[PDB]
Design a protein around this ligand. Structure first.
Ligand SMILES: O=C(O)c1cc2[nH]c3c(c2cc1Cl)CCCC3
Ligand SMILES: [Ca+2]
Ligand SMILES: [Ca+2]
Ligand SMILES: [Ca+2]
Ligand SMILES: [Ca+2]
Ligand SMILES: [Ca+2]
Lengths: 365, 356
């Protein structure tokens, strides 16, 4: 194996493939697979559940072959080299030698034959969509995912195809987020759970260019194709909850308010809320919302806002962190809070769009 | 106590006094004459800020949580007026239609530092004191049992102010002329107070006493206790005669160190240096049998030798230097090495050799 590549053509691909890799349990998991074949350098990083592949064209003389080298060490060397540095790489048995100017580097290798290989799988549904659409879908729901839960299925994100739309669903049991976006393609119905790190990697590969994203989904796998990068991940088997049964059936009390004004009022009030439970009180009356928070230290905050509201008065408690999470994810001018009573969930949406909806459970305080 | 003041005039002062026991997490607010005074402390050091009050005000003093009162004022929108009044066991904060009642502790209970006399006084530009601290800060010890090293020596001599810092493995010296005739004096400022003095940096007026150090800049006053101990003489740490002189490009030397370090030992990162005529070879290796080598064009001419260095110690020096050319003054394979900028003698750095 032999290749010479300019620093900047190797740098970003190296960062991408290293994504799925802190403390590797076994030595080979800390390594990247390098392959030179048909004038192309393929790089691969894995964690047994997912793979990130980068393909790099070779304009300089090269020789076929494959080896694995430490990801972090090889990335650090290339990054450390000066801009425009020519990086000559050759496999020499047990070591891979890296040369650039009068800089010399020798890396430990493990056989390419020993590198983990995710089994082949048959695609069942395929569609293309803009990178921006995928970014929107992930950023709207990502925060609602559970962290290291025993209910493994909640630690991921549901991906749903229905009609002309692609949909994401995330919930941690306490609060729910759901976002739908049209893609202009007739789709069958699949409901697959994408793991936590898979959601991160999907988000990582969107460089904000106009390169379309090609998505393939199977019974047990998902694949995402952006530019010269191919991401494959195994899916999480389980029974993910339906969002249609979590959405409030009867929201009779609709409140409309400025998103940023609601956000900054909640943020100021949060300062004096209970440090563990993060509870804020909401009193809603005609065209006005009052936000109050108190902690065991006997401290009190109060905020008063002009809103649009015609319904009956009610008092309701919320975990302020959940509300602030929703409002930061919406990033719009006007927000809509769909209420029922003090013991039922709220539905929070963008006032101008039904494409995203949020459900937060009420709180006793 | 009662005052109404613009948000703009509180933001900067609040940030400075929240720099440095339950009462230590609070800020002392005093209203006297036509001034609001804000004080934060950690028992060792103290930061006082003054802000003028033109709106109807009432004199008095209380204490309120530092992080909370700051987060409230900063959380409010720009152009907001902030009305504050003490009402029994609570301080009421009002702006627009935002209300805040914070828990209080009496002003009489707030820990004030003992009164002390100034023995040495001098004024110097902000940029000079920044320069003096920046050049030596990294060489301070962190949690060493030798408490006198957990800080920085401030020395006056002739017309110069000098900072010295050492962790026993590497030492840093920097001298700057301030244009004033000074008495010879040395004091040790605690590392926490050193970093605080750095953040507040229009001349700075400095007052040094037997057990305290004070700094006046703008409308802020920083007072800190001194570390009571005997600090090592830098004059005896500098090598007697480093006859071997290596001159290298600062950035090239930096990058060649950072790249080689990648393949050194993860626990104690060191590189080997082979010096010959107009060439420097930087090598490194690890328990995985991995090797790095960096060849550099330099200016030397002296005798060939091999010497190892801790990567972090050298990089720290080169990052402080921020210059074109670095001069490395060597003696032998087992002795300390002096590092300086090639064009200036203001700063000197001494690093122990490392065995690899
Ligand atoms: O390596 C050196 O030149 C060196 C020598 C030193 N001798 C002493 C210290 C010291 C530091 C260095 Cl860097 C600090 C504590 C007092 C005695
Ligand atoms: Ca080799
Ligand atoms: Ca003022
Ligand atoms: Ca000032
Ligand atoms: Ca030699
Ligand atoms: Ca050696």
């Amino acid at each position: 194996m032999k290749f010479t590549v300019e620093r900047e053509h190797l740098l970003k691909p190296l960062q991408q493939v290293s994504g799925p890799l802190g403390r590797p349990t076994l030595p080979i998991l800390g390594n990247l697979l390098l392959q030179v074949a048909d004038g192309t350098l393929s790089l691969t990083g894995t964690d047994l559940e997912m793979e990130m592949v980068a393909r790099v064209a070779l304009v300089q003389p090269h020789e076929p072959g494959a080896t694995t080298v430490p990801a972090r060490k090889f990335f650090d060397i290339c990054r450390g080299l000066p801009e425009g540095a020519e990086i000559a790489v050759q496999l020499e048995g047990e070591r891979m030698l890296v040369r650039s100017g009068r800089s010399r580097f020798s890396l430990s290798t493990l056989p390419a034959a020993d590198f983990p290989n995710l089994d082949d799988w048959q695609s069942e549904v395929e569609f293309t969509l803009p990178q921006a659409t995928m970014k929107r879908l992930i950023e709207a729901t990502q925060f609602s995912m559970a962290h290291q839960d025993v209910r493994y299925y909640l630690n991921g994100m549901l991906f749903e195809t229905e009609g002309e739309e692609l949909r994401t669903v995330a919930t941690d049991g306490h609060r729910l987020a759901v976002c739908s976006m049209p893609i202009g393609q007739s789709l069958p119905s699949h409901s697959v759970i994408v793991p936590r790190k898979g959601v991160i990697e999907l988000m990582r590969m969107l460089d904000g260019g106009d390169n379309p994203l090609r998505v393939q989904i199977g019974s047990n796998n998902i694949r995402a194709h952006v530019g010269d990068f191919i991401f494959t991940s195994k899916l999480v088997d389980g029974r993910f909850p339906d969002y249609r049964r979590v959405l409030p059936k009867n929201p009779d009390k609709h409140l409309e308010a400025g998103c940023d004004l609601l956000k900054q009022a909640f943020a100021r009030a949060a300062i004096l809320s209970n440090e563990k439970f993060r509870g804020v009180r909401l009193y809603v009356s005609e065209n006005q919302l009052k936000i109050t928070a108190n902690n065991p230290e006997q401290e009190e905050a109060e905020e008063i806002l002009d809103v649009t509201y015609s319904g009956a008065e009610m008092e309701i408690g919320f975990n302020v962190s959940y509300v602030l999470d929703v409002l930061n994810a919406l990033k719009c001018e006007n927000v809509r809070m769909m209420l029922t009573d003090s013991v039922s969930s709220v539905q929070i949406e963008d006032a101008a769009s039904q494409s995203a909806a949020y459900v937060v459970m009420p709180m006793r305080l």
